[PDB]
Amino acid sequence: VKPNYALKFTLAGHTKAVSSVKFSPNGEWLASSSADKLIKIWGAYDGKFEKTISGHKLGISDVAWSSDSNLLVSASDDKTLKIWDVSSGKCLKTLKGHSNYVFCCNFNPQSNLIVSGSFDESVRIWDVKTGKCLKTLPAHSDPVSAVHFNRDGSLIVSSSYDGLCRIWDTASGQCLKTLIDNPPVSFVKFSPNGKYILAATLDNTLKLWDYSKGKCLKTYTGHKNEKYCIFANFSVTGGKWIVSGSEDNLVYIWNLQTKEIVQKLQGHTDVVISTACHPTENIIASAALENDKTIKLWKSDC
Numbered sequence: 001v002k003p004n005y006a007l008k009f010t011l012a013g014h015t016k017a018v019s020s021v022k023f024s025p026n027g028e029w030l031a032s033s034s035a036d037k038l039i040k041i042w043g044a045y046d047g048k049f050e051k052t053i054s055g056h057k058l059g060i061s062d063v064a065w066s067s068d069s070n071l072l073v074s075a076s077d078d079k080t081l082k083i084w085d086v087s088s089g090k091c092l093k094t095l096k097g098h099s100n101y102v103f104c105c106n107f108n109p110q111s112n113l114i115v116s117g118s119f120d121e122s123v124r125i126w127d128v129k130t131g132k133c134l135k136t137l138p139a140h141s142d143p144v145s146a147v148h149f150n151r152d153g154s155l156i157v158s159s160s161y162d163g164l165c166r167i168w169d170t171a172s173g174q175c176l177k178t179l180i181d182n183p184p185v186s187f188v189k190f191s192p193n194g195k196y197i198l199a200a201t202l203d204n205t206l207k208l209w210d211y212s213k214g215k216c217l218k219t220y221t222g223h224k225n226e227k228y229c230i231f232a233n234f235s236v237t238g239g240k241w242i243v244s245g246s247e248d249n250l251v252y253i254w255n256l257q258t259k260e261i262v263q264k265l266q267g268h269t270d271v272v273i274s275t276a277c278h279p280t281e282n283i284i285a286s287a288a289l290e291n292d293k294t295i296k297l298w299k300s301d302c
């Protein structure tokens with residue numbers, strides 16, 4: 001079985017490169033962030049523009065949803081994160097403490113915490129309610145490319161240009177494990193079940209790691225990734241795929257177990273910096289850099 005993603009919508013409105021797209025947990029919405037300093041909200045199923053959320057003074061690298069789909073957090077070159085009320089568009093909190101661009105962010109499952117990664121080489125854990133930094137982890141020796149909580153929020157995985165992936169105990173901030181050749185690690189995230197870590201390196205390679213055993217299980221290649229921190233995903237709604245953007249302007253889809261490329265989605269006219277997989281339907285969102293500036297929604301039968 002191969003999927004058969006086809007283009008459903010192209011979403012225009014950002015005036016600079018799109019940095020990140022993410023589906024709301026409830027499936028209703030896509031949020032997009034951009035170098036244009038804006039967040040935009042779009043209907044997941046009809047592609048309809050809903051609203052613009054503004055307030056950052058510089059570009060945004062990443063955005064993430066709370067579990068109840070009511071809040072967003074954004075990470076900005078203004079050295080802050082902001083927590084947003086999606087319905088009102090209002091900034092509830094500005095999270096201050098990083099000493100350089102904030103690059104990546106995520107809520108925990110409970111959504112009482114946010115984790116952030118920065119060019120300042122640190123990972124910070126923030127209290128959503130107070131907006132105060134709870135912990136600063138001296139996580140890496142170069143910019144942090146990704147941060148992600150596991151299924152229950154007990155662990156954080158981080159990645160860096162330093163060539164390391166590290167796993168952190170949330171409660172204590174202590175490092176439990178380093179996975180260490182050491183090309184820049186450009187992306188990491190836990191599998192939905194929390195057992196595996198998907199890691200991108202800037203040698204055109206994605207790898208699936210068993211967290212428990214610290215061993216590489218699968219390698220995915222054929223795409224182009226030597227420059228940018230490109231988001232990758234587990235697609236679990238139909239077939240079990242790996243989905244990534246690519247610097248050849250394509251969305252790549254692999255069979256997770258066999259590692260074969262099963263589909264390449266053509267249409268973007270710049271680097272596909274971000275992909276996201278819908279929580280319940282076989283829908284991918286993709287987004288591209290400044291020669292394109294659009295988001296595409298794609299749908300598959302499997």
Ligand SMILES: CCC[C@H](NC(=O)c1cc(Cn2ccnc2)cc(-c2cn(CC)nc2C(F)(F)F)c1)C(=O)N1CCc2sccc2C1
Nearest residue numbers: 017018019035059060061062145160161184186227228229
């Ligand atoms: C080649 C240019 C530098 C590069 N850039 C991205 O790699 C990159 C990547 C992304 C996507 N992203 C964001 C968080 N995780 C992934 C976004 C944006 C983005 C930010 N802004 C402004 C606020 N605007 C943009 C957008 F995309 F809109 F042009 C840049 C970078 O940071 N690297 C180099 C590779 C590695 S490997 C470990 C660490 C690093 C650091």
